[PDB]
């Protein structure tokens, strides 16, 4: 298997090609390996930024809201994430 940072780079590669499904596959793997305590340069908050947008593109509304909340929890001055959270709470009334 690949390293956490290799998987992250695979996910960013897919995102930059506009391939949101494969972004989700790679970034879910990154989060899994980070929860296994594997060493890595990438932070959880950076992974959640790509993942939350990618799952929204795929149509997964409450999951995108959940992940955006998690992103803001770990990076409170992230203004774009705060803007995303306001969008999803207004859209989903939650």
């Amino acid at each position: 298997m690949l390293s956490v940072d290799d998987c992250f780079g695979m996910g960013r590669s897919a995102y930059n090609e506009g391939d949101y499904y494969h972004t989700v596959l790679w970034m879910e793997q990154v989060l899994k390996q980070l929860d296994a305590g594997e060493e890595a340069t990438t932070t959880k908050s950076q992974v959640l930024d790509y993942l939350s947008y990618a799952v929204f593109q795929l149509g997964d509304l409450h999951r995108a809201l959940e992940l955006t909340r998690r992103l803001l929890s770990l990076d409170p001055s992230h203004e774009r994430a705060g803007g995303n959270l306001r969008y999803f709470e207004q859209l989903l009334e939650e």
Binding site: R12, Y15, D49, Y50, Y53, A64, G83, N84, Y87, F88
Partner: peptide, 8 residues
């Protein structure tokens, strides 16, 4: 609109 993802 609308959520905004990472620039790159």
């Amino acid at each position: 609109p609308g959520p905004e993802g990472p620039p790159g």
